[PDB]
């Protein structure tokens, strides 16, 4: 609640930091960070109710002031402070942070990881093409449409180099040349597209990795969406 002017001079002699107009939702999480229970009456206050906190310093700004509860032993909470000069800088940063939290969230849940930068799409498009040709156990007419699915997976590495002005055909032949040497040897070496240099790269050394759960539902998800678009022979206009 608010603060009367009488207590302003009292808290100044004892150097007691006073606060007012506190958010109700924020005070519910203070019991977890600090550990102290909410005290409704001072007459029932106990010495064990007092919590523990670290250095608390307030930034000086004319319009608003902040209070830092930070530097705690067991806070069990975090706060992401987004700063920006303009309005669009705040919306872009907020979108990048929320996209990064959900990407790391799948790392602790799912122990499987996949390399990015087109390393999975190039390896999958090449494997599916040579797998059905050796076995020949599906169908003669079905493999015609399967080739369209393999060629549709190579647009991702061609798109990354298209925005920068690089030749998508040049970077495509360089990756295929490195994959031919890996099939002869029994070792395992991953190849990926390096956008900065323009040649291939090792995704384990560069550190480009994509979530397994995201890419698992990406192929299955895009399969049903792209299929239903071709299943409608006639656009149906009715209702009015």
């Amino acid at each position: 609640k608010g603060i009367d002017p009488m207590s302003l001079d009292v808290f100044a002699k004892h150097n007691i930091l006073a606060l007012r107009r506190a958010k109700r939702r924020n005070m519910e999480r203070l019991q977890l960070v600090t550990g102290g229970e909410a005290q409704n009456s001072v007459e029932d206050l106990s010495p064990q109710i007092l919590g523990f906190s670290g250095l608390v310093y307030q930034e000086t700004i004319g319009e608003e002031k902040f209070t830092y509860v930070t530097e705690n032993t067991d806070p069990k909470s975090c706060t992401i402070l987004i700063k920006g000069s303009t309005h669009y800088a705040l919306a872009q940063t907020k979108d990048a942070v929320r996209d990064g939290l959900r990407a790391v969230a799948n790392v602790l849940k799912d122990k499987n990881i996949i390399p990015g930068a087109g390393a999975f799409y190039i390896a999958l498009s090449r494997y599916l093409r040579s797998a059905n040709m050796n076995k020949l156990g599906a169908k003669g007419k079905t493999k015609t449409g399967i080739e369209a699915f393999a060629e549709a997976l190579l647009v991702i590495p061609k798109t990354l180099v298209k925005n920068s002005g690089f030749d998508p055909l040049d970077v495509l032949a360089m990756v295929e040349d490195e994959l031919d040497d890996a099939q002869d040897s029994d070792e395992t070496r991953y190849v990926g597209v390096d956008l900065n240099i323009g040649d291939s790269c090792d995704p384990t050394i560069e550190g480009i990795w994509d979530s397994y759960r995201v890419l698992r539902n990406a192929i299955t998800g895009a399969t049903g969406i792209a299929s239903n678009l071709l299943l409608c022979d006639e656009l149906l206009r009715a209702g009015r």
Partner: protein, 493 residues
């Protein structure tokens, strides 16, 4: 003039234009564009037709006839419209260019319908209605490609127990014989019960109520409770004696259970507490007719007129034990009280809501096999086999009806051609070879949907009941003739 007869064929072709590719299990998905910006991606044939805005009045007649067939059977809705729609296409040059009288065409379709039903009875094969394993591959048509595909083994036991319980032969020539005499409406009505498990779901015979005990302290175990039904509840019609007087009329037989349709006041709870009888309020009126059949207590309006002939016999258990965080009541016993109550248990309400409509359509197809103890070949085999017999009987007619009678065979081959158009192969090449396989193959040669090559149905064993094939060709003729009965259309109130 003749312009209205052309618009009747055009309107029938416009309605069937949408469902052309919607026939068969390989039917694709359609996109309906609404004026508000919404879309409907469902591939269900009869679900889209209700949202289609039509202009010509004959198009509304096809929607009403498709709605009637949708309530009786779950499938075959688009089959009737396509079969009846192709008849007007082959009869279009006969009605206009050939100048054939429309009643002659209508009369020819009536005689062709009689001969068509005879061919269906000949191609039918006997099936055992008491075989539980044979009904698995039949009902599976409404099972597969749904969420119930995993529990399909347990779903077959739920449908067969409900149909075999309420069926009564009663064969005789005196008053007429209903075959198995099945009633789906009142007896097979299903009530969804939240909580529980699907694997442990069983078929209960009786009436079930979810209302709990209205008194804090009451015995939770009763040996043989006797159901007592009443209309006027216990309340003021002296005020304390009037409620007690209404209770003494029921206690004359000293019942151990009391069930009230409406609510029960707290004054009547204390009088019936010393009598050793449970009080149950909040009972629906529609369920009162089913309670009297599973119990035998005569429903009486005034309490003073309650007869002593009521009995509480055939009561399985009184156990109130909580299931799914809610107190239930189970009247199921070891005997069949000329009815049953299907209890669907699951892990959520969304799963039970999907099983509800799926089980009702599964039992509708189940009755279709029970009514007619015969099966017909599916996948366009029945439609093609009848067209072969139409060419042989056309030569022995020797009359003016021969020309419209031969046009029926062209419409009978459109259903198997529809599955070929969705298969992806050459329709002309397959229909030419498929027609010759029925003569020397005893109509055992069907069409495979997954592969697309013409193969026999003896291996896969695809069969459908006859009553669906009979009602499909019977409604199609009635729908095609009705469109030809109107030769002029006028407007105004």
């Amino acid at each position: 003039g003749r312009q209205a007869q052309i618009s009747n064929i055009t309107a029938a072709k416009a309605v069937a234009d949408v469902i052309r590719t919607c026939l068969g299990p390989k039917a694709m998905l359609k996109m309906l564009l609404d004026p508000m910006g919404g879309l409907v991606l469902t591939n269900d044939g009869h679900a889209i037709l209700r949202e289609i805005d039509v202009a010509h009045p004959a198009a509304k007649s096809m929607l009403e006839l498709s709605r009637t067939q949708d309530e009786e059977v779950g499938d075959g809705t688009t089959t009737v419209i396509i079969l009846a729609g192709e008849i007007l296409a082959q009869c279009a040059p006969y009605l206009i260019e050939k100048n054939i009288h429309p009643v002659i065409i209508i009369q020819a379709l009536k005689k062709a319908l009689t001969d068509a039903l005879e061919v269906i009875k000949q191609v039918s094969k006997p099936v055992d209605v008491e075989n539980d394993a044979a009904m698995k591959k039949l009902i599976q048509a409404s099972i597969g490609t749904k969420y119930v595909i995993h529990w399909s083994e347990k779903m077959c036991e739920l449908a067969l127990d409900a149909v075999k319980t309420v069926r009564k032969d009663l064969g005789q020539t005196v008053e007429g014989e209903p075959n198995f005499e099945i009633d789906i409406k009142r007896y097979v009505r299903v009530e969804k019960i939240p909580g529980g498990d699907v694997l442990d779901s069983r078929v209960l015979k009786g009436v079930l109520l979810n209302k709990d005990v209205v008194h804090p302290k009451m015995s939770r175990h009763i040996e043989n409770p006797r159901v007592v039904l009443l209309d006027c509840p216990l309340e003021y019609k002296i005020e304390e004696e009037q409620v007690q007087l209404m209770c003494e009329q029921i206690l004359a037989v000293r019942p151990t259970l009391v069930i009230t349709e409406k609510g029960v006041s707290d004054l009547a709870q204390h009088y019936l507490l010393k009598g050793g009888c449970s009080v149950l309020r909040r009972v629906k009126k529609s369920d009162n007719n089913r309670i009297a059949r599973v119990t035998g207590a005569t429903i009486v309006n005034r309490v003073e007129d309650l007869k002593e002939s009521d009995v509480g016999t055939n009561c399985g258990l009184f156990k109130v034990e909580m299931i799914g965080d809610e107190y239930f009541s189970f009247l199921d016993n070891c005997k069949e009280p000329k009815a049953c109550t299907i209890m669907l248990r699951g892990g959520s309400k969304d799963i039970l809501n999907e099983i509800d409509r799926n089980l009702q359509d599964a039992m509708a197809v189940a009755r279709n096999v029970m009514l007619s103890p015969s099966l017909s070949p599916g996948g366009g085999a029945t439609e093609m086999a009848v067209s072969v017999k139409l060419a042989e009987k056309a030569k022995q007619l020797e009359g003016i009806q021969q020309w419209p009678y031969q046009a029926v065979a062209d419409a009978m081959e459109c259903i198997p051609r529809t599955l070929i158009q969705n298969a992806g192969g050459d329709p002309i090449r397959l229909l030419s070879q498929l027609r010759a396989k029925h003569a020397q193959g005893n109509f055992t040669t069907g069409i495979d949907g997954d592969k697309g090559k013409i193969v026999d149905m003896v291996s896969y064993g695809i069969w459908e009941p006859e009553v669906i094939k009979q009602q499909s060709v019977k409604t199609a003729i009635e729908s095609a003739c009705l469109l030809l009965r109107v030769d002029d259309i006028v407007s105004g109130v």
